[PDB]
Design a protein around this ligand. Structure first.
Ligand code: CLA
Ligand code: CLA
Ligand code: CLA
Ligand code: CLA
Ligand code: CLA
Ligand code: CLA
Ligand code: CLA
Ligand code: CLA
Ligand SMILES: CCCCCCCCCCCCCCCC(=O)OC[C@H](COP(=O)(O)OC[C@@H](O)CO)OC(=O)CCCCCCCCCCCCCCC
Ligand SMILES: CC1=C(C/C=C(\C)CCC[C@H](C)CCC[C@H](C)CCCC(C)C)C(=O)c2ccccc2C1=O
Ligand code: SF4
Ligand code: SF4
Ligand code: SF4
Lengths: 143, 80, 165, 63, 41, 741, 73, 73
């Protein structure tokens, strides 16, 4: 598996237009693009509001928030049994792949993804906040 | 960014990852508490702080622990 | 004459209050007939009022400047000047019953702890066991002090405490 | 083998546990080098709605 | 009627019966002994 | 044939086996309790039939039999009111003198001193003065005897037992299938022809044959003992042809369409009866004849088994516009598939109807001697107003529940519901703006007047004197309905109400109904009404449209309808659910209707109700509403402080219980603030520190003590808040108006 | 009347100090949250999990005690 | 007199609430359980449930009975 490049030639589902779509965050900070290959035309539920019709084949869809993309991801994975993958697009054109960051979905092991933010102690073996006092910023004993 | 720490009481039931609505958590093999999986939080820049993860953790109290930190656009669920 | 209070038997505002209430009731009575349901009801209420005032004045109560009876909660002032049946005796009269309720509840809980599904004998009362304990719990002070003297009234420190104890 | 038997009653010594100083019954003890190998089942559930939890050999004690 | 008597053994029905009985006892006490302010008898 | 009876024989066995097992209706609670939250969930999910199962047939059967149980309970309550008017009332004394004797139908037992509550109401009676208006309703029915109330009570108990037998039957013995409930064409045809058409026709028959002659003789001074009995007015046509000579013609004028001959008992008089202060029963009889015809022709509209008629699916599907996409398609399926979609609409219109009832029962008092019982009139406005607001909030609730559970986006593509959910942001944004605009321009007017009159600038207030905001549109409508019989309703002898204008009707010295003027104070309070209504709509509609998703939480539908929060994340997500929007819409419904009923009470006591002893109408508060209600200090002083003198000095009198429920309601309302201001996590730790003391003494229960759910805390808090506030207002109203009115 | 209102005053004092003492002592930990010291003094909640953790901080205990203090005074 | 009394009493109530608030902040931010090993301040936290439960009992009794007497009158 290798990181897929975002295809802009991918069509979008049949949506009649909403008001829950993109805001100035898309133009200024960032927005998100989710893609998936469908086997048929199915009326799914937009996380922004309203129902859209996915197209037979590949689809592409814009969203202003990552939680929207993962909501649709779990909806397409659980109700339609698809395998979508979304990105993070910046207004200058930079695309950043996000969800299956190793190819497989994060609930499954991949035999090589590194464990981050793992405290190797018990939650009661954390120190008292008096020991992490005056560490610069206000810091939790979990660090 | 919020602080998500995962402790060695994790029995590796994948529930915290399935519950996460932002893809912050993932399950790493054997480079943790023991073999047979373990969880991890590499993408905490996308954590909003909903604590669905520790709502779904079945261990005593919570192996996964969200400590609410500095907020941002990604950590406040803003589409604007 | 404990705290400057006058006895209700010789209090003047007490009698004035009795006369006021009876005057109100007879004012209501004058608009009705001789033997009607309102008339009999108001006559019964007047008699209840008269008996109530007579029985409070007979019981040795102490009345204030307002004519209302004032109770004496202090034992020693109540036991000396004959006012124990105001707050002091009803104190133990309450506590017997209250500890009786609590002891029956405790005994029922301890009884249903041993069963297979103890929680279902709490939403569904085991009325046989409950009535047996409610009848045999009338000796709750003796049994309570005997459970206390044996050390089997209090649980040890197997109690579920917090991380900083 | 390590730990208690697979039907024994066990008092939990984990301070942050819901069942601290509370009696539980062993489901099983994983005989590997796993940390927190003892699986204890409790008659009463915690605030999350769980009755089972994994504890270490130093967090368990008889009766 | 084992199940019916089990139903009457439930918490709310037993509470209704017991508090009806308690309230009726107190009510009849307060009828036959009107205005009991002190323990004089 | 399509529309037919379709039932299953003996679906559910009749046994107490599932009575002994609480929580049987769900998969989670049937396992038994371990924590106390089970005890609350057992009750919260008791009638949540659409989560006990998935098949709409069993849900529908449960609903049907539950409706039967509600009807049986309503019949028990009605029979109880008739029975209390038969045994424990001064009704037969009140009929002889309704202008002097206070209607009472509740006697109190003399146990702990509450015999003081048995007030001197009149007629040689001692009881609680009722304000439900049953005496006026019974006089309008033509009762005139306690035996008829007794037998009506026994008939109500018979019908209650019948309804409960019907529920048991239609659940356990022969329960209908789903395709029977789904015949909405037949249900509407029948509920319009037979229920509301034939019901109004039968009530018209009673009004022709029993109410009209009995009440005509009652108004002619005849004693209720010497009035002919209704069966004697049925058999002996001579009595009726003496009272109405058109009864000498028989029913021929109907079949010959010489209906004008019936103009003796089918009138269009309008206005009020000068002797009773209520609507003419001939007017109501003609009314019910007319709406019976109207509903019987309306019940022949939909197509059931013979090709004539309409298919509602065809009306809906063929109603679409260029602005609105596919239109009403899929709505037939929504409403024949979702019980909650039906319940939402039905509750909304039923509550709006109850408020219609409240507004149309005081301006057009239908019953004799209803208007001059100011307590009954005030209570009957307040009660139905409150019931309407509650039903409307429930309509929003069940619309949200539909949107969460029963909504399917496949059925709804570019139909009206999809197109609403797609632009909910425009909807709620414009609603927010109008709520803000109205809040400013309706309440800041009151603040402006407070500031001006506090600064000593009464020439700068918003009053009928300084800066007039006259309600010219409502004034024009008043004048348009006052002048209606002259031009636009020539066969009406008078206007519908005297509130439009004209002469007053005073009965027994008391003012039954008089013209109602509207000025700047009325403008301001009406705009306050619209403001509060719009905010309640904002909350409930925002809960509906954002019940599945928002820009905050896109997966709110999977979270559910009733959930506290997703977390403290996204800055904090508490009360994002569509349940918590109902929880807040309840508060705003209370705030709206409190002001509505306050407007009613003050306007009525100041500008309508009163006595005419000499030449001059002397009102209760002296017409201060015009000049005093420009300020919040006005509603404080001259309404909440002035009209509270009767409830706080009621101690030692018959109305003392009203003062008691004043104080206790102030208690309960504030008690609600323990649940609304606080949060569960504090009480769980307090509870566990208490459980430590229970463990130490070996009295810790097996059912683990938990703090109430978050949702349950909010529900308890809103319940205690509404109860205390509404009961405070109830006590204040009744104690005030039973004394001064 | 002085008796009754002095006992109301006792109620208010004891309940205010109950809330405050409880927040102070459970500031470091509860059975619902034994790692409460790791979250600071004023944190919003610990989520809807474990039954619900609203107003669980010590800050919120002080908060709820200010109401009972205002009532006491 | 009225203004002075009400003033200083409300000031006192707020100050006394802040006292316990900062005691909580002490327990969180400044308390060291190992440097206070066995002293009175740790002995408070060791029997905190007794303090909280007895304060709760006093508050509960006083409220029950004061409200009961007031409602009775
Ligand atoms: C919590 C505070 C409080 C207190 C201390 C009281 C105290 C009292 N109230 Mg007040 N009251 C209160 C709250 C309170 N009330 C509230 C909140 C309300 C509003 C609802 C009222 C409303 C109210 C009214 C309206 C009246 C009272 C009355 C009374 C008196 C009742 C005496 C009585 O019933 O003799 C009972 C005497 C006994 C000996 C019974 C004790 C209990 C058991 C039965 C004893 C055990 C004996 C035996 C072993 C049982 C056999 C077992 C059985 C199973 C066979 C007493 C002065 C009445 C009165 O006249 O006051 C002066 C009265 O009319 N109260
Ligand atoms: C709660 C505390 C309290 C207080 C402040 C008082 C106050 C007083 N007591 Mg009382 N007393 C109390 C509890 C209390 N008593 C208790 C619990 C008992 C045991 C039942 C007594 C038994 C008692 C006696 C026997 C006498 C007093 C006397 C007195 C007075 C000295 C004073 C009025 C004396 C007295 O009569 O005062 C004039 C006296 O002789 N007290
Ligand atoms: C909405 C229904 C309703 C309501 C709220 C009431 C309420 C009341 N009824 Mg009425 N009643 C009703 C229906 C209702 N009734 C019906 C349907 C019948 C016909 C069977 C009666 C027949 C009836 C009689 C014959 C009497 C009452 C009485 C009473 C009072 C006391 C009841 C009591 O203590 O029972 C105790 C209940 C239990 C112990 C259980 C109370 C005001 C009594 C009353 O007011 O006396 C003055 C009385 O004597 N009721
Ligand atoms: C549902 C409403 C209703 C009902 C039930 C009645 C009923 C009645 N009206 Mg009224 N009426 C009504 C509405 C109603 N009216 C309205 C809306 C108007 C305004 C237009 C009038 C205007 C009006 C006038 C002007 C008069 C009546 C009259 C009558 C009576 C004569 C009926 C008649 O001749 O019709 C004929 C009806 C039938 C032939 C049906 C009889 C059916 C029987 C009961 C069948 C049962 C037999 C059974 C199968 C076997 C026996 C069982 C057993 C013994 C073995 C009757 C009491 C007259 C009267 O008596 O005045 C007091 C009269 O003069 N009505
Ligand atoms: C035709 C009327 C109608 C019908 C059939 C329903 C039916 C339903 N509603 Mg809806 N609802 C209605 C009106 C209606 N509601 C109104 C008017 C409101 C506004 C208050 C609501 C608000 C509402 C909400 C917010 C919710 C429902 C829910 C439900 C479902 C379960 C209800 C349940 O189990 O409660 C069982 C009954 C109780 C728990 C009892 C409530 C206790 C009340 C509040 C006590 C106070 C009442 C009393 C008169 C005051 C005196 C108190 C005295 C005893 C001291 C069920 C489908 C729930 C649902 O479907 O979610 C999944 C839900 O969450 N309803
Ligand atoms: C008195 C108490 C109070 C007040 C003033 C408000 C005020 C408001 N609520 Mg809130 N609310 C309250 C209690 C209150 N609420 C309670 C107890 C509940 C129950 C939980 C709610 C639940 C609730 C919900 C659920 C909603 C509101 C909404 C609103 C707004 C609608 C009215 C509006 O914008 O008009 C304009 C503002 C006013 C009328 C407030 C008074 C301001 C006056 C006019 C003077 C202005 C001063 C001026 C600027 C000079 C400044 C001086 C300078 C020195 C600063 C407004 C902010 C709604 C909202 O935000 O959407 C629109 C909404 O959806 N409220
Ligand atoms: C000698 C007295 C004293 C001192 C030095 C401190 C010092 C401190 N306190 Mg303590 N505190 C005190 C008294 C004191 N407090 C009292 C009396 C109380 C009870 C009221 C508290 C309750 C308390 C809590 C609960 C917390 C602190 C916290 C703090 C710290 C930061 C304060 C902060 O956030 O600033 C910024 C504070 C503000 C901007 C205050 C908000 C505005 C206030 C409420 C005034 C609003 C009034 C309004 C403007 C009036 C308008 C009137 C107009 C309408 C007419 C700091 C160590 C915090 C801390 O240490 O965090 C861990 C913390 O959480 N204190
Ligand atoms: C009028 C409002 C009100 C009332 C009555 C209470 C009452 C109480 N609060 Mg407070 N509280 C309030 C507002 C109120 N609060 C507000 C606005 C807040 C801010 C959120 C708080 C915050 C708060 C905290 C933080 C704490 C309390 C605590 C307590 C309890 C103190 C113990 C006590 O006095 O027991 C006496 C109890 C009462 C007087 C209330 C019960 C009323 C009667 C006696 C019960 C029976 C009535 C009747 C028979 C039942 C009818 C029901 C049904 C049959 C219809 C008590 C339940 C403390 C606690 O829980 O410790 C124990 C505590 O820690 N409260
Ligand atoms: C209220 C007047 C709104 C203006 C008006 O006249 O609307 C009328 C306008 C016309 O709708 P249509 O005739 O296309 O709708 C046909 C219906 O059968 C629904 O399909 O309704 C809309 O476009 C949607 C609602 C607009 C809501 C705008 C609120 C401002
Ligand atoms: C006071 C309060 C509590 C504590 C309330 C406790 C848990 C329950 C109140 C009383 C219960 C119902 C016990 C009453 C007695 C039982 C019904 C059993 C009967 C036993 C005898 C009395 C018959 C919360 O859990 C809560 C949660 C979320 C927001 C606000 C609050 C809140 O304000
Ligand atoms: S808080 Fe929410 S977003 Fe953050 S890790 Fe936990 S579940 Fe994922
Ligand atoms: S839910 Fe808890 S136990 Fe399961 S994998 Fe996540 S952290 Fe580990
Ligand atoms: S309800 Fe309580 S737990 Fe949920 S988000 Fe709000 S504060 Fe946090």
């Amino acid at each position: 598996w290798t990181v897929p490049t975002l295809n802009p030639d991918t069509p979008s589902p049949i949506f009649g237009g909403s008001t829950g779509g993109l805001l100035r965050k898309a133009q200024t900070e960032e927005f998100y693009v989710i893609t998936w290959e469908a086997k048929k035309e199915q009326i799914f539920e937009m996380p922004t509001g309203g129902a859209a019709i996915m197209r037979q084949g590949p689809n592409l869809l814009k969203f202003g928030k990552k939680e929207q993309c993962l909501a649709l991801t779990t909806q397409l994975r659980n109700k339609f049994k698809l395998t979508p993958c979304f990105y993070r697009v910046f207004p200058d054109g930079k695309v950043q792949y996000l969800h299956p960051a190793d190819g497989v979905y994060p609930e499954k092991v991949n035999a090589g993804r590194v464990g981050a933010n793992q405290n190797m102690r018990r939650i009661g073996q954390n120190v008292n906040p008096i020991k992490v006092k005056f560490s610069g910023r206000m810091m939790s004993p979990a660090e | 960014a919020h602080i998500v720490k995962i402790y060695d009481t994790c029995i590796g039931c994948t529930q915290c990852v399935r519950a996460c609505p932002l893809d912050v958590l993932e399950m790493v093999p054997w480079d943790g508490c023991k073999a047979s999986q373990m969880a991890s939080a590499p993408r905490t820049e996308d954590c909003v702080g909903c604590k669905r993860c520790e709502t779904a953790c079945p261990t005593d109290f919570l192996s996964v622990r969200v400590y609410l930190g500095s907020e941002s656009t990604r950590s406040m669920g803003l589409s604007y | 004459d404990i705290a400057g209070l006058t006895p209700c038997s010789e209090s003047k505002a007490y009698a004035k209050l009795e006369k006021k209430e009876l005057k109100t009731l007879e004012k209501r009575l004058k608009q009705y007939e001789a033997d009607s349901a309102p008339a009999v009801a108001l006559k019964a209420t007047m008699e209840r009022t008269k008996a109530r005032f007579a029985n409070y004045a007979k019981a040795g109560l102490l009345c204030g400047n307002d004519g209302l009876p004032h109770l004496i909660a202090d034992p020693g002032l109540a036991l000396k000047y004959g006012h124990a049946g105001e707050v002091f005796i009803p104190t133990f009269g309450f506590l017997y019953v209250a500890g009786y309720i609590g002891y029956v509840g405790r005994q029922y809980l301890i009884a249903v702890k041993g069963e297979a599904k103890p929680t279902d004998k709490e939403i569904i009362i085991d009325v046989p066991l409950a009535t047996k304990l409610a009848w045999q719990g009338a000796g709750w002070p003796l049994a309570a002090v005997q459970e206390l003297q044996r050390g089997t009234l209090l649980e040890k420190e197997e109690n579920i405490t917090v991380s900083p104890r | 083998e390590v730990g208690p038997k697979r039907g024994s009653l066990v008092k939990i010594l984990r301070p942050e546990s819901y069942w601290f100083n509370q009696v539980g019954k062993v489901v099983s003890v994983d005989q590997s080098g796993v940390r927190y190998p003892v699986v204890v089942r409790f008659e009463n559930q915690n605030y999350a709605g769980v009755t089972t939890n994994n504890y270490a050999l130093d967090e368990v004690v008889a009766a | 009627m084992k199940d019916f008597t089990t139903y009457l053994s439930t918490a709310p029905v037993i509470a209704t019966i017991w508090f009806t009985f308690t309230a009726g006892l107190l009510i009849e006490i307060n009828r036959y002994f009107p205005d009991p302010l002190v323990f004089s008898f | 044939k399509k529309v037919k009876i379709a039932v299953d024989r003996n679906p559910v066995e009749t046994s107490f086996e599932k009575w002994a097992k609480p929580g049987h209706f769900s998969r989670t609670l049937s396992k038994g309790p371990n924590t106390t939250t089970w005890i609350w969930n057992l009750h919260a999910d008791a009638h949540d039939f659409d989560s006990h199962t998935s098949d709409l047939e069993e849900i529908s059967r449960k609903v049907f039999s539950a409706h039967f149980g509600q009807l049986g309970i309503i019949f028990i309550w009605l029979s109880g009111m008739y029975f209390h008017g038969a045994r424990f009332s001064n009704y037969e004394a009140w009929l002889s003198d309704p202008t002097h004797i206070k209607p009472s139908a509740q006697v109190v037992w003399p146990i702990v001193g509450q015999e003081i509550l048995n007030g001197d109401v009149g007629g040689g009676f001692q009881g609680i003065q009722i304000t439900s208006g049953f005496f006026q309703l019974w006089r309008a029915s033509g009762i005139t005897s306690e035996l008829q109330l007794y037998t009506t009570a026994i008939g109500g108990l018979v019908m209650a037992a019948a309804m409960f037998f019907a529920g048991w039957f239609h659940y356990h013995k022969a329960a209908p299938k789903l395709e029977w409930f789904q015949n909405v064409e037949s249900m509407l045809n029948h509920h319009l022809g037979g229920l509301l058409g034939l019901g109004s026709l039968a009530w018209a028959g009673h009004q022709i044959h029993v109410s009209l002659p009995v009440n005509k003789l009652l108004d002619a001074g005849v004693d209720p003992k010497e009035i002919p009995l209704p069966h004697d007015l049925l058999l002996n046509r001579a009595i009726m042809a003496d009272l109405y000579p058109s009864f000498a013609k028989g029913i021929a004028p109907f079949f010959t369409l010489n209906w004008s001959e019936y103009s003796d008992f089918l009138t269009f008089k309008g206005g009020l009866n000068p002797v009773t202060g209520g609507l003419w029963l001939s007017d109501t009889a003609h009314h019910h004849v007319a709406i019976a015809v109207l509903f019987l022709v309306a019940g022949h509209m939909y197509r059931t088994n013979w090709g004539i008629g309409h298919s509602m699916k065809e009306i809906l599907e063929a109603h679409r516009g260029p602005f609105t996409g596919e239109g009403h398609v899929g709505l037939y399926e929504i409403l024949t598939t979702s019980w909650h979609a039906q319940l939402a609409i039905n509750l909304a219109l039923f509550g709006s109807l109850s408020i219609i009832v409240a507004h149309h029962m005081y301006a057009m008092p239908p019953y004799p001697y209803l208007a001059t019982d100011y307590g009954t009139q005030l209570s009957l406005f307040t009660h139905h107003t409150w019931i309407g607001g509650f039903c409307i909030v429930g309509a929003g609730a069940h619309a949200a529940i539909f949107m969460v559970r029963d909504y399917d986006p496949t059925n709804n593509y570019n139909n009206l519901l999809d197109r609403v959910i797609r632009h909910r942001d425009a909807i709620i944004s414009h609603l927010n703006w109008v709520c803000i605009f109205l809040g400013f321009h309706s309440f800041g007017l009151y603040i402006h007047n407070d500031t001006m009159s506090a600064l000593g600038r009464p020439q700068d207030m918003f009053s009928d004197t300084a800066i007039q905001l006259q309600p010219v549109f409502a004034q024009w409508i008043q004048n348009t309905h006052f002048l209606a019989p002259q031009l636009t309703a020539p066969n009406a002898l008078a206007a519908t109400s005297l509130t439009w204008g004209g002469d007053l009707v005073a009965v027994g010295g008391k003012v039954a109904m008089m013209p109602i003027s509207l000025g700047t104070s009325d403008f301001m309070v009406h705009h306050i009404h619209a403001f509060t209504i719009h905010v309640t709509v904002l909350i409930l509609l925002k809960g509906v449209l954002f019940a599945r998703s928002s820009r905050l939480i896109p997966d709110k539908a999977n979270l559910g309808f009733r959930f506290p929060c997703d977390g403290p994340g996204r800055g904090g997500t508490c009360q994002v659910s569509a349940w918590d929007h109902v929880f807040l819409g309840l508060f705003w419904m209370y705030n709206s209707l409190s002001i509505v009923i306050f407007h009613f009470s003050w306007k009525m006591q100041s500008d309508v109700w009163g006595t005419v002893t000499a030449s001059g109408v002397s009102h209760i508060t002296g017409g201060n509403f015009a000049q005093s209600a420009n300020t919040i200090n006005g509603w404080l002083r001259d309404f909440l402080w002035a009209q509270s003198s009767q409830v706080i000095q009621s101690y030692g009198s018959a109305l003392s219980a009203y003062g008691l429920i004043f104080l206790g309601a102030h208690f309960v309302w504030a008690f609600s603030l323990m649940f609304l201001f606080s949060g569960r996590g504090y009480w769980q730790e307090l509870i566990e520190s208490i459980v430590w003391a229970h463990n130490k003494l070996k009295v810790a229960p097996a059912i683990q003590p938990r703090a109430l759910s978050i949702t349950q805390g909010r529900a308890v808090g809103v319940a205690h808040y509404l109860l205390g506030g509404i009961a405070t207002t109830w006590s204040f109203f009744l104690a005030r108006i039973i004394s001064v009115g | 009347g002085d008796f009754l209102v002095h006992h109301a005053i006792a109620l208010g004092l004891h309940t205010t100090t109950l809330i405050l003492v409880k927040g102070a002592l459970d500031a470091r930990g509860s059975k619902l949250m034994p790692d409460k010291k790791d979250f600071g003094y004023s944190f919003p909640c610990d989520g809807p999990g474990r039954g619900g953790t609203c107003d669980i901080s010590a800050y919120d205990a002080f908060y709820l005690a200010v109401f009972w203090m205002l009532n006491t005074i | 007199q009225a203004a002075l009394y009400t003033h200083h009493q409300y000031i006192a109530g707020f100050i006394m609430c802040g006292a316990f608030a900062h005691g909580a902040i002490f327990f969180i931010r400044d308390y060291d359980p190992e440097q206070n090993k066995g002293n009175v301040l740790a002995r408070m936290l060791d029997h905190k449930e007794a303090l909280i439960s007895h304060l709760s009992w006093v508050s509960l009794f006083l409220g029950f009975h004061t409200l009961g007497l007031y409602v009775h009158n």
